[PDB]
Write a protein that binds this ligand. Structure first.
Ligand SMILES: Cc1nnc2ccc(-c3cnn(C)c3Oc3ccccc3)nn12
Length: 127
């Protein structure tokens, strides 16, 4: 039932880069999904206490959310685009693992994932 510490958004010894693909992931991918009508549940880590989901963190061992992704992109935490893409995929997968098909939260994740795939399809080549 307690909430774990949120995923790491700062790590000075972790190598980082600012590239055109990571810039695209913030400016295009991370803005398009953030502004969506169904973004709200995914804008911060899941609060297992407030949401009365005591089982959440016993099932979801790799939690992820757009709030964490936002901070990671803004504070230049990533080395490459694949690390960021993996975070988005982890967020959607966690939602599908914890919930059942047709659930409101699953429908919300599906709408965001559709857009995510549309935008990632246009990921620019590395400069
Ligand atoms: C379940 C479940 N599985 N992953 C997640 C991630 C976030 C949230 C979340 C955030 N705020 N509130 C009130 C939440 O609950 C719901 C429940 C149904 C629809 C919308 C939100 N729920 N959630």
């Amino acid at each position: 039932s307690m909430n774990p510490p949120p995923p790491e958004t700062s790590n000075p010894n972790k190598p980082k880069r600012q590239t055109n693909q990571l810039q695209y992931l913030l400016r295009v991918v991370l803005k398009t999904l953030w502004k969506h009508q169904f973004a709200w549940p995914f804008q911060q880590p899941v609060d297992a206490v407030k949401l009365n989901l005591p089982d959440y963190y016993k099932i979801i061992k790799t939690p992820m959310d757009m709030g964490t992704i936002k901070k990671r992109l803004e504070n230049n935490y990533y080395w490459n685009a694949q690390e960021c893409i993996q975070d988005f995929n982890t967020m959607f997968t966690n939602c599908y693992i914890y919930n059942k098909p047709g659930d409101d939260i699953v429908l919300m994740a599906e709408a965001l994932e559709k857009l995510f795939l549309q935008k990632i399809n246009e990921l620019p080549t590395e400069e």
